[PDB]
Amino acid sequence: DKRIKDEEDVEKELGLPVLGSIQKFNMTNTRRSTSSLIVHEQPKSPISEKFRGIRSNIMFANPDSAVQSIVITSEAPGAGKSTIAANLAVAYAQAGYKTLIVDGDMRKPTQHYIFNLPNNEGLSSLLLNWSTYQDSIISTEIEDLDVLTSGPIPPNPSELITSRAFANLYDTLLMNYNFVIIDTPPVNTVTDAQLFSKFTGNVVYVVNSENNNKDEVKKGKELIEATGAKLLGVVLNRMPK
Numbered sequence: 380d381k382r383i384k385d386e387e388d389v390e391k392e393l394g395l396p397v398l399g400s401i402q403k404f405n406m407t408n409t410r411r412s413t414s415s416l417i418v419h420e421q422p423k424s425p426i427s428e429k430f431r432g433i434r435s436n437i438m439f440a441n442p443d444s445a446v447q448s449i450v451i452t453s454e455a456p457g458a459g460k461s462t463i464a465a466n467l468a469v470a471y472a473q474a475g476y477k478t479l480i481v482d483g484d485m486r487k488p489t490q491h492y493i494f495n496l497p498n499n500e501g502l503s504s505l506l507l508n509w510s511t512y513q514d515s516i517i518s519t520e521i522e523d524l525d526v527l528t529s530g531p532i533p534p535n536p537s538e539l540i541t542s543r544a545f546a547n548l549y550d551t552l553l554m555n556y557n558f559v560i561i562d563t564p565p566v567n568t569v570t571d572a573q574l575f576s577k578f579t580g581n582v583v584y585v586v587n588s589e590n591n592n593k594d595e596v597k598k599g600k601e602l603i604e605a606t607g608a609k610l611l612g613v614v615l616n617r618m619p620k
């Protein structure tokens with residue numbers, strides 16, 4: 380019934396460009412990757428090429444665009460925000476950008492799972508001054524890729540995002556990294572992604588082609604655009620091919 384299913388649907392129903400399309404993972408398109416971090420584990424796979432194309436699009440499709448950071452978000456849970464964010468981050472690092480991925484989903488974080496990292500310190504603890512900057516950001520075994528995990532689950536993420544601590548951190552991150560990617564919770568349920576979007580001014584919108592309602596997806600788009608941020612485009616995920 381009501382799915383945004385493909386590129387035509389994105390153009391016609393949402394009026395956005397498609398930055399890339401990510402197929403549902405299989406043995407062939409991931410070359411039997413052991414994890415969902417395809418770009419790292421199988422850098423020559425078809426899927427890995429798609430993420431490189433997304434990277435090239437963001438950085439080179441628009442002449443004298445100067446994108447320093449992006450929010451990765453979606454309308455609903457399970458769209459593939461975390462997976463797209465992590466793989467895109469690796470793609471940036473491989474290309475030689477000093478890259479940070481920030482786990483800004485302080486409600487249901489998964490970047491520590493994806494990158495196999497401890498989550499005792501991270502974004503929440505840093506913002507609460509429980510941990511230091513240098514202790515909270517992890518340099519991964521992937522060269523040019525750092526990760527700021529979510530940290531412990533805080534009582535009120537909104538309070539942290541709107542704190543002067545975060546505004547000041549964000550400024551510091553822009554000065555320390557060539558590219559910053561912020562993973563977020565879904566738009567329709569909490570305003571976290573909208574708040575982060577006010578900072579980055581640039582948003583990549585992930586749409587699960589397998590399972591979505593067009594009215595819900597459209598509502599999320601409108602909420603993002605209402606922040607004043609530029610919605611760069613859509614990444615279609617779980618595509619049949």
Ligand SMILES: Nc1ncnc2c1ncn2[C@@H]1O[C@H](COP(=O)(O)OP(=O)(O)O)[C@@H](O)[C@H]1O
Pocket residue numbers: 401402403404415453455456457458459460461462463489616617618
């Ligand atoms: N293209 C894909 N093919 C198969 N599985 C995927 C794909 N994208 C994401 N997933 C899986 O779907 C689940 C939800 O993805 P996740 O990135 O956590 O979504 P979100 O952050 O939007 O909730 C994860 O287990 C992830 O490995």
Ligand SMILES: [Mg+2]
Pocket residue numbers: 460461462484487488489563
């Ligand atoms: Mg997630």
